[PDB]
Structures are given as C-alpha cells and as structure tokens.
Amino acid sequence: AFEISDFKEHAKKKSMWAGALNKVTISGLMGVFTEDEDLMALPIHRDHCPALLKIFDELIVNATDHERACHSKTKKVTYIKISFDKGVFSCENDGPGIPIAKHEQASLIAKRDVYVPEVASCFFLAGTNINKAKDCIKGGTNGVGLKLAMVHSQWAILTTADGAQKYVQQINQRLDIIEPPTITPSREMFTRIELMPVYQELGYAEPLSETEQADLSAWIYLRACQCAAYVGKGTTIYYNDKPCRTGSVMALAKMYTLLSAPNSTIHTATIKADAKPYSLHPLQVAAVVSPKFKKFEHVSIINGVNCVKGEHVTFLKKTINEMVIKKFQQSCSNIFVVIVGSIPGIEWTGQRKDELSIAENVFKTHYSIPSSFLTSMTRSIVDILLQ
C-alpha cells in the first residue's frame, strides 16, 4: 500500500509540478490573433492542459533568465527564437551555451560520464539557482522546469554550443531514454531545446486538431509577446521566425484592449524604488480605463514570469483607490493594467509561479508611483463613476 516514487514517475502523475495533466478550464486563458496587420489578445474559451502550456513556459523563462544573466556581460543574448510547427516546440537563445564539461558529482551519482547539459536537462533539483541570491531576479529557482519539459516529451533534443564545441543529446520517452551526447568542434554559441509533447497523454488529438493547433499557437505567440516587453532593449523575440513587435508595456496594453477600447488613452508610469536592490529594478506600467471593462484585470510579467496574483498589484490598486475616494468625495473595476519588470527577493506559492509572495511593506517602504499617473488614472475613473 505504501509506495515510493522516483521523480519521473511522480511528475507524470502529479499536478503539483506543472498543474493539471489533462484539459481543465483555465480562468483568463488568452492568446494573440492577427487580424489584418493588427495584433489582438483574445480569450480562449476552451479547456486546455495547464502542464502542456507550462513546459512551453519553462523553456521560455529559461531563455529570459539567460538574457538577464548575460545582459551586463560581453557576450549578451541578442535573440530568443520560439517555434511551433507540426506539434514540435523549440526555443533557441544565443549568448554563452551551457558548459560542455564533465560534471564530477553527477558522473559519480550515475556511474558513467555525465556532462553539465545532461545535469541541466535530466537531473531533478539541479541547476545554477539552487543557492539563489536574495537579490536574484531570474525566474528560475528550483532546478526542475527543464526536467518537466523532458518528462512531458515523446522525444526531445538538447543542442548547445560554447564557441569551441557543439553538444547534441536526445532525451526520449518521457526521460526514460537518455542517449549519449554527440560532441563536435563548432564556432557557434547558443542553446536550443526542441521537443514533441505527449499531446495524447495530456488529452489532445494526435495529431493536434485545427482548433487545438490554433489555440496553442495563439497562446505561445502571446507568451512570446510578453517576453518581448520584459527582455532588455538589445534582445529580439521571434515566433515562427517573425519578430514580436511588442517591445513596450504600451504595445502590450494596446494588444489586450484593441477590440474592447480602440483609440484609447494609455496612462503610463515607471514605478521606482529608493534603495538597492529595489532601485536597480524600475517597473513599467501602462493602464487603460474604460466603462466597457467589467472588472479589474492585470497582466504582470515579473522576473520573466506571467504572474496572475501578487502584492505588487494590490499596492497599485490601494494607491489608486485612496486617490479615487478622495477625489470622488470632493474604484478599480474599470482598469486594465500591464506591469512589467524585475522584483528582487520574491518567493512563489509553487513550481508553476502563478502567485508571488512578499511583504506588502516592501512597496509601502521603498516604491513610489508617479503622481501624474495617479492623477490621470483618478480623473478617468472619477468621470466614469460620475456618469
């Protein structure tokens, strides 16, 4: 009756790692769709498998983490290329590759030659964020995300090049079959993950239906557009070899409000903090206020992660609410707001990183929302309330 599981078997059966392992109703599920030359974020009103969307997210956050790691160094990340075609998902980024070197501890554990890229892709609770600095703004913390991608892949290829050598390794049948890597001379420098998810096991048609393909493509495109707003000014994000043109929170706010509030006013702010490490990490904000909006909604890209709940939102809402109450006397259900940037020292409620955890006083003590933004938001909210 009392059974003991290994990580692989556990990750194939348990929702705690990446969420539900079958299709469920995902509240607020969105994708981006192109109408003419316009990008429009629209709801996806069909059940989808959270764990499937999460293994796409794990690879994308790994690439955005690498962009952040490299952004002040000589060899920077200049691109992240995301691809989705015939069911195959890939994510490739430039900059220094995963070191092509024997890992002494892993080789002893496994009783065979294990190189660093195999540790990164095949060993659970393993990576460069196991001892994470208090000020680190990478999303990665657990050493599990890439292994979850591998466990939900029928086949996967890890390719990395360090400017000297290229390493290619097949990781097949949900991490059951790790093929010995092919190592060759190369002047390339990059990391690529290519995989075919276990679509049928996660509740999808094999091959994907027209609707499943379209929904997954829209979701991935929007996730790439979210990255594009987060990464540094030197990095381009591509989706199926097309650049994602959403380099600002204003561009993100437009994509989400184009159908409901075309030709709208975009209230903008940079939220800044008054002490390191917070002062190193300004937050970019764009908000639209419309009577057509039925309840408060945010899109938060924090540390490269799409965060659906956190005290950073609460801080903005309470601050606006206090001003609205005062002006009206002489509050948030008509706001759509985009918040993008890094926050050091956050913790998460789970591997999925749906909710960040923090002391509210971090914002009260350190951060200031520009008066001009609060005044313009309050003016717009009050006019609606008055009507």
Ligand X SMILES: Nc1ncnc2c1ncn2[C@@H]1O[C@H](COP(=O)(O)OP(=O)(O)NP(=O)(O)O)[C@@H](O)[C@H]1O
Note the residues at the interface with Mg ion (CB under 5 A): 62, 140, 145
DSSP-derived pairing of the beta strands 297-302 and 283-289: unpaired
Measured from the CB of residue 116, what is the shortest distance to a second copy in angstroms?
5
Q: Which among 44-52, 140-148, 204-212, 328-336 is the span making contact with ligand X, rule CB under 6 A?
A: 140-148
- Residue from 50, 145, 310, 341 binding ligand X (CB under 6 A): 145
Residue 368 interacting with a second copy (CB under 8 A) = no
Residue 104 interacting with a second copy (CB under 8 A) = no
* Structure tokens that stand for 80 in this block: 């992240």
Radius of gyration of the chain measured on its C-alpha atoms: 22
Nearest to 21 by CA among 57, 56, 49: 49
Q: CA-to-CA distance for 291 and 162, rounded, in angstroms?
A: 53
Q: CA-to-CA distance for 150 and 145, rounded, in angstroms?
A: 9
Measured from the CB of residue 352, what is the shortest distance to ligand X in angstroms?
10
Residue 13 interacting with a second copy (CB under 8 A) = yes
Residue 222 dihedral angles phi and psi, to the nearest 5°: -65, -40
Residue 181 interacting with ligand X (CB under 6 A) = no
Residue 217 interacting with ligand X (CB under 6 A) = no
- Neighbour tally for 50: CB within 10 Å: 20
Measured from the CB of residue 63, what is the shortest distance to ligand X in angstroms?
5
Measured from the CB of residue 372, what is the shortest distance to Mg ion in angstroms?
38
Using the minimum distance from each CB to ligand X, give the nearer residue, 63 or 316.
63
Q: What is the secondary structure of 305-326 as a DSSP string?
A: EEESB-HHHHHHHHHHHHHHHH
Measured from the CB of residue 279, what is the shortest distance to a second copy in angstroms?
21
Q: CA-to-CA distance for 89 and 264, rounded, in angstroms?
A: 36
- Neighbour tally for 234: CB within 10 Å: 12
Residue partners of 207: CB distance under 8 A and separation at least 6: 86, 87, 199
- Residue from 31, 95, 127, 341 binding a second copy (CB under 8 A): 127
Residue whose Cβ sits closest to ligand X: 140
Using the minimum distance from each CB to Mg ion, give the nearer residue, 63 or 335.
63
Size of the site for ligand X (CB under 6 A): 20
Residues 241/333, Cβ–Cβ less than 8 Å: no
Please give the angle made by the CA atoms of 104, 106 and 109, to the nearest 5 degrees.
110
Residue 123 interacting with a second copy (CB under 8 A) = yes
Residue 141 interacting with ligand X (CB under 6 A) = yes
Which string of x and - marks every residue 347-366 that binds a second copy (by CB under 8 A)?
xxxxxx-xx-xxxxx-----
Using the minimum distance from each CB to ligand X, give the nearer residue, 144 or 287.
144
Asked whether the bond before 207 is cis by omega within 30 degrees of 0, the reply is yes
* Structure tokens that stand for 126 in this block: 């393993």
Question: For residue 305, which amino acid is it?
Answer: V
Measured from the CB of residue 127, what is the shortest distance to Mg ion in angstroms?
7
What residue ranges bind a second copy (CB under 8 A)?
A: 1-7, 10, 13-16, 19-25, 27, 47, 50, 99, 103, 105-106, 109, 116, 119-120, 123, 125-128, 130-132, 141-144, 311, 314, 347-352, 354-355, 357-361
What residue ranges bind ligand X (CB under 6 A)?
A: 58, 62-63, 65-66, 93, 98, 120, 127-129, 140-147, 191
